[PDB]
């Protein structure tokens, strides 16, 4: 039986690309000279001329579907995309913010997602060095990282001076492993990162079973599951964003 | 939550198209002037110059995947295509037969698959009237219909004189409804159809809980599930094929 997991990852991002184009006319941010698909990064038009930007980073979205229990096969008509960034996108558009949506493919068929995290680091560095750094009108960025993909955000904070425009970082972690920030340029960054971040994790997390300050203010949600903790704490998150 | 079922149907057929091209260099049979995708019908090269053709008709393949039980989401790395026609394709290639593979999209989001069956009827009529009818070297066709898609086959038998080249029809039914053949051109066809068909259905089927001759020799397998009854009776099927 032939695996179908990679095809699915691309099918998911492509339907997302479709909705975001039809509904809010997003577009692609050519991440040329990297062997990643075009719709990896998507963004509001005239993003270059935007004041405030929300940048949402995530791994491929989950698919929920019922499953004929004994055949074990997936009910195609019940299949839906659980898009954890869509509500942040709609929230920011409704305040005329610039939106950047980054999609990082999961590393399937491997003990964990180390490699996906590395890709996340590389894409956010490309984004910052070739774009954004050359955005004239950008003032105030908020970063939202869903799942493992958040590694790319923390990496960028530590490997680029950034505090000129970065006002908030949010991480909806779930059951994933906490990402440390190890500053390279400035040690103040440790204190800044703790006072300007929210790291939302599953109630059932390994931690709390003592998180150190390099991790940046970890909070224990009352539920589990990325979708659940985002629903649970979307207001606390957006609240925290606006006060910066 | 946005449905994802249609995208999936196209993603499945497209990975199939990939394997069949890389592994046996299949190609597309332009079904022009119909608003169906290119990879609907796929076939061995030089099909026009083939003596014996196996024609395998099926609905979109199932996807099996484990599912994180409480989040309810699908394990992408465990996801696989359950391709019920692949073993017939490999069986026929290993005897140098011509292969034609027809894919009919399921009608998702509707009480049943009436519409898909109608599409199946239309594609096999297009195939027979614009192609095949004009194949010089074709002698001996066997039809294999998986699931509801078999309706297109029965329809063609009754709406076109066909017995010049059709030697066997096989239907791996499962739990679907039996397709009657109502001859239009010739009444002998009822007797021919019963003596030249095998209709394999699930042990748990509605029938046997008395099938009439218009249905063409229904057999009760010992298991349930298309994949299971094909595994169970692949030899009986191929056996029945060769004796014609």
Residue numbers in the entry:
A (entry chain A), B (entry chain A): 450 to 658, 664 to 698
Give the authors' words.
Hda1 is a typical class II histone deacetylase from Saccharomyces cerevisiae. Two related proteins Hda2 and Hda3 are essential for the activity of Hda1 both in vivo and in vitro. Together, they form the yeast Hda1 HDAC complex, which specifically deacetylates H2B and H3, with Hda1 homo-dimer as the catalytic subunit and Hda2-Hda3 hetero-dimer as the non-catalytic subunit. Hda1 contains an N-terminal catalytic HDAC domain and a C-terminal ARB2 domain. The ARB2 domain is defined by sequence homology to the Arb2 protein, which is a subunit of the yeast Argonaute complex and is essential for histone H3 Lys9 (H3-K9) methylation, heterochromatin assembly, and siRNA generation.
To gain insight into the role of the C-terminal non-catalytic domain of Hda1 functioning in the deacetylation process, we determined the crystal structure of ARB2 domain of Hda1. The final model has been refined to 2.7 Å resolution and the details of the data collection and refinement statistics are summarized in Table 1. The ARB2 domain adopts an α/β sandwich architecture with an arm protruding outside. The core structure comprises an eight-stranded β-sheet (β1↑-β2↓-β4↑-β3↑-β5↑-β6↑-β7↑-β8↑), flanked by three α-helices on the proximal side (α1, α3 and α8) and four α-helices on the distal side (α4, α5, α6 and α7). The protruded arm region spans residues 509–532, and contains a short α-helix (α2). Further examination of symmetry-related molecules indicates that two ARB2 domain molecules form a homodimer. As shown in Fig. 2A,B two symmetry-related ARB2 domain molecules come together to form an inverse “V” shape via the respective arm region. Residues Ile512, Ile523 and Leu525 located in the protruded arm region of each molecules form a hydrophobic core, which dominates the domain-domain interaction. The ITC results show that all of these mutants could weaken the interaction between the ARB2 domain and histones, suggesting that the inverse “V” shape groove is indeed involved in interacting with histones and the residues His604, His608 and Arg609 are indispensable for binding to H3-H4.
